[PDB]
Amino acid sequence: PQSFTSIARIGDYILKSPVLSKLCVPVANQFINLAGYKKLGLKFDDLIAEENPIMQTALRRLPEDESYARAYRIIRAHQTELTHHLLPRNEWIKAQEDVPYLLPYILEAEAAAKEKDELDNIEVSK
Amino acid sequence: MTAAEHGLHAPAYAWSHNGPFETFDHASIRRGYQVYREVCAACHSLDRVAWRTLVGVSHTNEEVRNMAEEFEYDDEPDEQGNPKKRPGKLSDYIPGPYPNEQAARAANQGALPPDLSLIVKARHGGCDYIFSLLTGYPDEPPAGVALPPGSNYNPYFPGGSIAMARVLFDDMVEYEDGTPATTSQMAKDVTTFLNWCAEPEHDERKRLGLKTVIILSSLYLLSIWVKKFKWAGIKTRKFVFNPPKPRK
Amino acid sequence: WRTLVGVSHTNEEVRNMAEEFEYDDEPDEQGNPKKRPGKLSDYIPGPYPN
Amino acid sequence: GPPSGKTYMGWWGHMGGPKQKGITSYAVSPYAQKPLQGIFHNAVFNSFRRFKSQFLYVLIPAGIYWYWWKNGNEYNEFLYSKAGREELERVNV
Amino acid sequence: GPPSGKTYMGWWGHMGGPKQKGITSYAVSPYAQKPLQGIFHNAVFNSFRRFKSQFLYVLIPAGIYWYWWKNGNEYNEFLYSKAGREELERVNV
Amino acid sequence: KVEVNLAAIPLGKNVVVKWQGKPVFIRHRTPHEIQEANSVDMSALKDPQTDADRVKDPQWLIMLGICTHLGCVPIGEAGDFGGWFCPCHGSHYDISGRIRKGPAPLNLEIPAYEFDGDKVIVG
Amino acid sequence: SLYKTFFKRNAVFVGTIFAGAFVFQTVFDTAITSWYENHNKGKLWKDVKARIAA
Amino acid sequence: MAFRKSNVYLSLVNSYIIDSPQPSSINYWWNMGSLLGLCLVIQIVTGIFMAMHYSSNIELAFSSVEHIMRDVHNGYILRYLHANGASFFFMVMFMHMAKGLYYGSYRSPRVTLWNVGVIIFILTIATAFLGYCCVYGQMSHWGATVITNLFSAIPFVGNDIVSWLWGGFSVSNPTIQRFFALHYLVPFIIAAMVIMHLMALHIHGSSNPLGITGNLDRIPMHSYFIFKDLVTVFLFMLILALFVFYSPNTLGHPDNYIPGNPLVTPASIVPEWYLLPFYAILRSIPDKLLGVITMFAAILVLLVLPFTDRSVVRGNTFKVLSKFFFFIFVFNFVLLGQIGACHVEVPYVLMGQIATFIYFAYFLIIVPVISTIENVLFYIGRVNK
Amino acid sequence: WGGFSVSNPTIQRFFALHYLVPFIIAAMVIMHLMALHIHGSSNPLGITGNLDRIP
Numbered sequence A: 001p002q003s004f005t006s007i008a009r010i011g012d013y014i015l016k017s018p019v020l021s022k023l024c025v026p027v028a029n030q031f032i033n034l035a036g037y038k039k040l041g042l043k044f045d046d047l048i049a050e051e052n053p054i055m056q057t058a059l060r061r062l063p064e065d066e067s068y069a070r071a072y073r074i075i076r077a078h079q080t081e082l083t084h085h086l087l088p089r090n091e092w093i094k095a096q097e098d099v100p101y102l103l104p105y106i107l108e109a110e111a112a113a114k115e116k117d118e119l120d121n122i123e124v125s126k
Numbered sequence B: 001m002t003a004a005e006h007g008l009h010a011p012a013y014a015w016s017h018n019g020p021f022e023t024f025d026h027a028s029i030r031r032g033y034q035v036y037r038e039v040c041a042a043c044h045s046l047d048r049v050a051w052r053t054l055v056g057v058s059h060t061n062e063e064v065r066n067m068a069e070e071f072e073y074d075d076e077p078d079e080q081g082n083p084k085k086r087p088g089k090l091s092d093y094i095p096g097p098y099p100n101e102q103a104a105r106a107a108n109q110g111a112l113p114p115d116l117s118l119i120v121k122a123r124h125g126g127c128d129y130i131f132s133l134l135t136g137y138p139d140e141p142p143a144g145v146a147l148p149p150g151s152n153y154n155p156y157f158p159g160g161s162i163a164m165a166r167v168l169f170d171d172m173v174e175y176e177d178g179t180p181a182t183t184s185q186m187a188k189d190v191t192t193f194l195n196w197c198a199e200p201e202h203d204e205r206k207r208l209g210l211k212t213v214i215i216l217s218s219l220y221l222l223s224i225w226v227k228k229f230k231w232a233g234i235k236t237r238k239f240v241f242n243p244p245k246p247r248k
Numbered sequence C: 001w002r003t004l005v006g007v008s009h010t011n012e013e014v015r016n017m018a019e020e021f022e023y024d025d026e027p028d029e030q031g032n033p034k035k036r037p038g039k040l041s042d043y044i045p046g047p048y049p050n
Numbered sequence D, E: 001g002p003p004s005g006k007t008y009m010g011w012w013g014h015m016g017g018p019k020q021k022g023i024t025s026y027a028v029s030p031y032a033q034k035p036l037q038g039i040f041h042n043a044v045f046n047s048f049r050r051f052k053s054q055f056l057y058v059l060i061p062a063g064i065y066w067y068w069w070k071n072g073n074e075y076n077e078f079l080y081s082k083a084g085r086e087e088l089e090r091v092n093v
Numbered sequence F: 001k002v003e004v005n006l007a008a009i010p011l012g013k014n015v016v017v018k019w020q021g022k023p024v025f026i027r028h029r030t031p032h033e034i035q036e037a038n039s040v041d042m043s044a045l046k047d048p049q050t051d052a053d054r055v056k057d058p059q060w061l062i063m064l065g066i067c068t069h070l071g072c073v074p075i076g077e078a079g080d081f082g083g084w085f086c087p088c089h090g091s092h093y094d095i096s097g098r099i100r101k102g103p104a105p106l107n108l109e110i111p112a113y114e115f116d117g118d119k120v121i122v123g
Numbered sequence G: 001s002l003y004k005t006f007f008k009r010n011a012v013f014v015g016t017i018f019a020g021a022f023v024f025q026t027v028f029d030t031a032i033t034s035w036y037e038n039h040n041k042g043k044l045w046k047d048v049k050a051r052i053a054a
Numbered sequence H: 001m002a003f004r005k006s007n008v009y010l011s012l013v014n015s016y017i018i019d020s021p022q023p024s025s026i027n028y029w030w031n032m033g034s035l036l037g038l039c040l041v042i043q044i045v046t047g048i049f050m051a052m053h054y055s056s057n058i059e060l061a062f063s064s065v066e067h068i069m070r071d072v073h074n075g076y077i078l079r080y081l082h083a084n085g086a087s088f089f090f091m092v093m094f095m096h097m098a099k100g101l102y103y104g105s106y107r108s109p110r111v112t113l114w115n116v117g118v119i120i121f122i123l124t125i126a127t128a129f130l131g132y133c134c135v136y137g138q139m140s141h142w143g144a145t146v147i148t149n150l151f152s153a154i155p156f157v158g159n160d161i162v163s164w165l166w167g168g169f170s171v172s173n174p175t176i177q178r179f180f181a182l183h184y185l186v187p188f189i190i191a192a193m194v195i196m197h198l199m200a201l202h203i204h205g206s207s208n209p210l211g212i213t214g215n216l217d218r219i220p221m222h223s224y225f226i227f228k229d230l231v232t233v234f235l236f237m238l239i240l241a242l243f244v245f246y247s248p249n250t251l252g253h254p255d256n257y258i259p260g261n262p263l264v265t266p267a268s269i270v271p272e273w274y275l276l277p278f279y280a281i282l283r284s285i286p287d288k289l290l291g292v293i294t295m296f297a298a299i300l301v302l303l304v305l306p307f308t309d310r311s312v313v314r315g316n317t318f319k320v321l322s323k324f325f326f327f328i329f330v331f332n333f334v335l336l337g338q339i340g341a342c343h344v345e346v347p348y349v350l351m352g353q354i355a356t357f358i359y360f361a362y363f364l365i366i367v368p369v370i371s372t373i374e375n376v377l378f379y380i381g382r383v384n385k
Numbered sequence I: 001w002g003g004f005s006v007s008n009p010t011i012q013r014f015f016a017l018h019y020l021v022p023f024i025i026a027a028m029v030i031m032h033l034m035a036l037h038i039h040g041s042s043n044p045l046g047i048t049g050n051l052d053r054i055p
């Protein structure tokens, strides 16, 4: 995996650019609705793999109202596939509700892990 | 490679043993041994076929005992250690014309005629290739080809030139049932007989294939019904969410 | 024959010993039997055929 | 023996997910539901729906590889004919 | 997986014996003790002491089975000699 | 190893002997007539090899039959002189063993046949 | 009757699917052989042995 | 507790096929691993009953397979179920590996489970090659000549592996006798690697087609997936029975019904259908030492796959560009098998060379570039700025 | 026998069974050591040994 610090370093440079966001953002909105995760009642941060110690740290620090709602969306998405159906269009995720709710907990767990690791490998002399 | 170096493609005739429910024609196996004994056994062997396997398939017991007795087999030695011969019995194998391989090439201008016990299953085409090989010699070669001395043209052989000449002609055997022995009629019966020599289990195999497929299809249909009954409670399970009151 | 060389005889002696026996060869161009003298890879013969 | 290194799965009772609160579920026995209900409106209509979603990710890579094979095949039959006898030379060596 | 049925042994820390209290132990490193001290006062005497305890439970069952074999053997050599030619009859059948 | 004496191979008989599990080509020929076949020049062919290590015994013929790709097998006594017709995937050859047909990159191997006591051991 | 007299008891439930496994075995084996030797009538050895009765 | 949970032996059966927690949304692609356990049992059982009648001497080997076909009571059923079962064993294993390449099963924490699977795939190729040389047909002799001659190109040790593999100077009687003894043995090494395979599975469990955590909805193995495993077993045995009883020589070659001859070469040497994609990788490299390296590198490049996937989502369910290039790789593997069954002619030497380039560029170039492109496309299509 | 006496079918099937039973023995040895691990060994004293153990 790449890192979320590296993704946002590249992804912010595209958005503070007048000619780059002209080209790439119409392509990126077509990539989202051709993925089809909103039709299963899912945001994007539900799809992130969680078997690593940075991602296990960010799930403990979540508030427990957002932690209970995420566990119901995942259970609803497993029952939807074994019936091989989609949800009704009343219950799809709209484009305003797909927020990065887990990105701020992730980005500060990574900046603390980088700072701890570059203080264990030190070459201070006299 | 060119189509002259691959050989012509044999067509698809309609053999009576094609299909999943068909049997060999045992009157065309019986007439096929008559063309082997009179035209074919002069140069080719049948080394994988025993005498006893013909009883109940194309001849009776007293006929195969009479057929095997006109050949000489080597016996265990006498009380002085000298060789000894004996007539044939049912457990023996059908003999071939040559004692060794050098004597076979010496009578066929260097070429070696193969063994015909497995020739159906060892050729691309099967029954269609051995039939079309025999009834496919032209009366004259095509214009422009140059044959070696002592060769014959046949377009079903890869390369065009073969060391076997045409051996089937009209009315060269006389059948016992009274069937007219034409060129295509006798060529049909050797290929039905020679396919039995490669596959003697053919009629037994398709009868046990009937019992296995009927049993396994009624087991496959019942497992689809049984699975959907035991999986009914999971597919109809429901889920409601009410958000909890927030000071836990 | 070859197993005696270096144990009880030399190489020129075992080649001379094995040559006074007749072994059966592969047939000629007509398919007739043929004989040959012995070599080192052969086995020591016995007196009776059967 | 001793306990080993920890994993990301447990057993019944301590499977190792987040805590749940406020979800209800209902079900009815299989002995009360009608035999073979979901045999229509599903492969005649539902697998006909699932095919139509995921087919264009299969048929466009398939069409490129079948155009490449059929076009490369008919140039081999041309090179081993009488009309393609001179072009077999100056190409192979 | 799940925990299984309980046994009569554990592991390091919970081996499963009675609780201990009031026993002390001492030891010295092998690098401080003299090389091959217990090679005499060991098998020249110790094992000469351990043999003398447990030998009469071996040699009395051995002497009965070797008397039975040697006495049964010499009656077979007598029956197959010239002096034992008449007693081979009236015994075997 | 197979021993050949100076008594038992006459002039024109190309027998394919199965020596060491491998085919071989064995006959005696005149020492004059290979002046007819390879009188072209030195290096009109792929590799520069005409006559030098062709036969260290200049009045005999010995050649292996293992090819570079597969180990294909020819017919004997057929050709311009009665040499090589090897219709497998490619080349025919000559009296020597170099090509008249086909690409055929590398040369077929000459085995090590020696001379002991008026006996000729092959291999 | 049925299931509690025919498919419940374990010497009936299992004692029919192992007892009926033999009576099914032979009548299925006999009826398959009668269909095969009637679909291929005229080509077997039994048919052409009665034709050489001369 | 119950007796099936307190016994030392019954608890292993209960913890693996009775009370094992499964994700409730897995589909019929997760049934290929149980069906491979049935394939190994059929191959071991039918091969032991055929080994009672077989002779491994080079002058008795071809005729003893004919003795099983003609003389042994129901001997034709044993051979046909054995020769056709090996093709069905390789077809399910190609579908088993392609599922885990699709749903992302080779990533953490299942890297060790993917590495033991690559070892099983090499031992299954070695097993099928050794047993095909035991019939000693005309395809058996020249397939063993071509393969064993490849090891004569290893630098500074070349004429010592090949003379140790032959037991002599060519493919002869010591080669056939030692190939049957090794053929009895490697199916028992495969069965011990299968036990170690299921141990690494039990500590983490299976994935799911959604690709997220499955610890929120689990059902047991017994009475729900045993009756779903039963559906594909009865479909397997019915299609296998259609080949053994109605078309038993369709997945074969007629030149194996000729006894092998070192002095006559066949006009066309072609392997079985499951070695044709790897045979075409070998003939594309004009060097001899570089050709044998590339054919073995086509299986060891599966071990670089946990490192080149730079995605943050597991699987291919919601990835548009990664679903397109998965089927470029699939049909390039069916084009590689068709090139390896053709002649070496000149439209086909360039088609088989470019298609070998697409094999290695998928793992090392196409995957790490398309992975990071979809990480940036998921980000700027969500973050409002 | 595969026939009427100890003959050629007897020797060919005895070697194929001889290759196989040493691999059944090795699987019974694995099951043997599993039953040992849950209780451990005894001692010449014949009493409990959970009071003095070394690795």
Ligand SMILES: CCCCCCCCCCC(=O)OC[C@H](COP(=O)(O)OC[C@H](O)COP(=O)(O)OC[C@@H](COC(=O)CC)OC(=O)CCC)OC(=O)CCCCCCCC
Pocket (backbone or CB within 6 Å): A084, B224, B227, D047, H027, H028, H029, H088, H091, H092, H231, H232, H235, H236, H239
């Ligand atoms: C070599 C022979 C070995 C025999 C076994 C091989 C089987 C491997 C085939 C690949 C496979 O695993 O199929 C999975 C996938 C469909 O799986 P799914 O869970 O998404 O949908 C299940 C359904 O919705 C509910 O199926 P349901 O549970 O409701 O009914 C059971 C079904 C049984 O059918 C099967 O077993 C499917 C193999 O009964 C019927 O359909 C009645 C038919 C008369 O299939 C597909 O999506 C596309 C299939 C293409 C296969 C390509 C093979 C290339 C060689």
Ligand SMILES: CCCCCCCCCCCCCCCCCC(=O)OC[C@H](COP(=O)(O)OCCN)OC(=O)CCCCCCCCCCCCC
Pocket (backbone or CB within 6 Å): D050, D054, D058, H027, H029, H093, H094, H095, H097, H098, H099, H102, H209, H316, H317, H330, H333, H334
């Ligand atoms: C190096 C050695 C590695 C092994 C060999 C590599 C390739 C070997 C090829 C053999 C296998 C052929 C198919 C590949 C395996 C399929 C596994 C797979 O892709 O399964 C998941 C896929 C998704 O289908 P769903 O609609 O159920 O899921 C919704 C979206 N995820 O389900 C699907 O299958 C999609 C439906 C399309 C049918 C798939 C088969 C297409 C038929 C042509 C394939 C060519 C085979 C001859």
Ligand code: HEM
Pocket (backbone or CB within 6 Å): B035, B036, B039, B040, B042, B043, B044, B108, B111, B112, B113, B114, B119, B130, B133, B134, B161, B162, B163, B164, B165, B167, B190
């Ligand atoms: C009914 C009679 C015969 C049948 C069905 C028959 C069938 C065959 C077959 C199938 C082949 C092999 C073709 C191949 O290799 O692809 C063959 C080859 C051959 N047959 Fe016959 N044959 C018959 C009679 C004869 C006779 C009477 C002779 C000689 C007098 C003969 C001489 C040969 C020779 C020399 C070959 C080798 C051809 C070659 O390799 O070029 N055959 N025959």
Ligand code: HEM
Pocket (backbone or CB within 6 Å): H040, H043, H044, H047, H048, H050, H051, H054, H065, H079, H082, H083, H086, H089, H127, H128, H131, H132, H134, H135, H183, H184, H187, H190
């Ligand atoms: C994973 C297991 C196995 C695989 C993939 C396998 C594969 C093969 C194959 C492909 C053949 C060639 C058959 C043909 O083309 O006609 C063969 C032959 C043979 N194998 Fe196996 N085999 C396996 C297990 C075994 C075992 C364990 C034995 C011995 C106990 C065995 C004994 C034989 C025998 C006797 C032959 C003889 C030739 C023949 O029957 O055709 N096999 N094997």
Ligand code: HEM
Pocket (backbone or CB within 6 Å): H029, H030, H031, H032, H033, H034, H036, H037, H040, H093, H096, H097, H100, H103, H105, H106, H110, H113, H114, H117, H118, H120, H121, H194, H197, H201, H205, H206, H207, H208
């Ligand atoms: C004789 C050979 C094999 C057997 C018996 C076998 C058996 C199994 C079984 C029973 C499962 C669990 C059920 C399932 O997930 O479908 C499984 C999963 C798996 N196998 Fe195999 N397998 C074999 C070969 C392979 C090979 C050749 C590979 C890869 C190169 C492989 C990689 C995997 C992986 C990664 C999984 C986990 C997939 C997941 O959980 O999503 N296995 N195998």
Ligand code: HEM
Pocket (backbone or CB within 6 Å): I029, I032, I036, I040, I041, I042, I043
């Ligand atoms: C290939 C055959 C066998 C192997 C490899 C084997 C191996 C072992 C091993 C390693 C132990 C551990 C304690 C020790 O080393 O003494 C042990 C203990 C034991 N074995 Fe075996 N054994 C075999 C056969 C047998 C047989 C034939 C019997 C009895 C009929 C048996 C009964 C036992 C018992 C009762 C113990 C426990 C003894 C104790 O803990 O005091 N084993 N075995």
Ligand SMILES: COc1c(O)c(C)c(C/C=C(\C)CC/C=C(\C)CC/C=C(\C)CC/C=C(\C)CC/C=C(\C)CCC=C(C)C)c(O)c1OC
Pocket (backbone or CB within 6 Å): H016, H017, H033, H034, H037, H040, H041, H044, H045, H048, H191, H192, H194, H195, H198, H201
């Ligand atoms: C995902 O969930 C699953 C799952 O689906 C499955 C199927 C399994 C089970 C899978 C297996 C058990 C595969 C393992 C298979 C083996 C290890 C093969 C074992 C080897 C054999 C059975 C060969 C030995 C056979 C014999 C010795 C009998 C043949 C010989 C005979 C009959 C001798 C004949 C002679 C005479 C005189 C009769 C799981 O463990 C599991 O949980 C992970």
Ligand SMILES: CCCCCCCCCCCCCCC(=O)OCCCOP(=O)(O)OC[C@@H](O)COP(=O)(O)OCCCOC(C)=O
Pocket (backbone or CB within 6 Å): H012, H013, H016, H017, H034, H195, H196, H198, H199, H226, H229, H230, H233, I030, I033, I034
């Ligand atoms: C028709 C039914 C439905 C349709 C098809 C489905 C078929 C269902 C039947 C499947 C067959 C049952 C599977 C058998 C089983 O219990 O699986 C266990 C195998 C998995 O591995 P393991 O043995 O658990 O390893 C577990 C391990 O504990 C084994 O090793 P260990 O004992 O720890 O080592 C001890 C030896 C020490 O050796 C040394 C020296 O280190």
Ligand SMILES: CCCCCCCCCCCCCCCCCC(=O)O[C@H](COC(=O)CCCCCC)COP(=O)(O)OCCN
Pocket (backbone or CB within 6 Å): H006, H007, H008, H009, H010, H012, H013, H195, I027, I030, I031, I038
């Ligand atoms: C390398 C892989 C080897 C394969 C191992 C797979 C798992 C083992 C096979 C699974 C089936 C086991 C069937 C055994 C049935 C239960 C036995 C039992 O009741 O346990 C025993 C009795 O077993 C025996 O006497 C010998 C068993 C012979 C095994 C021959 C195969 C009863 O033991 P008990 O009830 O006291 O429970 C104490 C738990 N330690």
Ligand SMILES: Cc1cccc(-n2nnn(C)c2=O)c1COc1cnn(-c2ccc(Cl)cc2)c1
Pocket (backbone or CB within 6 Å): H125, H126, H128, H129, H130, H132, H133, H139, H142, H143, H144, H146, H147, H269, H270, H271, H272, H273, H275, H276, H278, H279
């Ligand atoms: C050449 C040929 C020609 C004719 C029949 C066969 N052949 N050999 N075994 N089988 C089953 C088969 O078809 C073959 C062998 O083809 C190939 C291709 N790759 N391999 C291969 C790959 C890896 C290993 Cl470790 C061993 C062998 C073997």
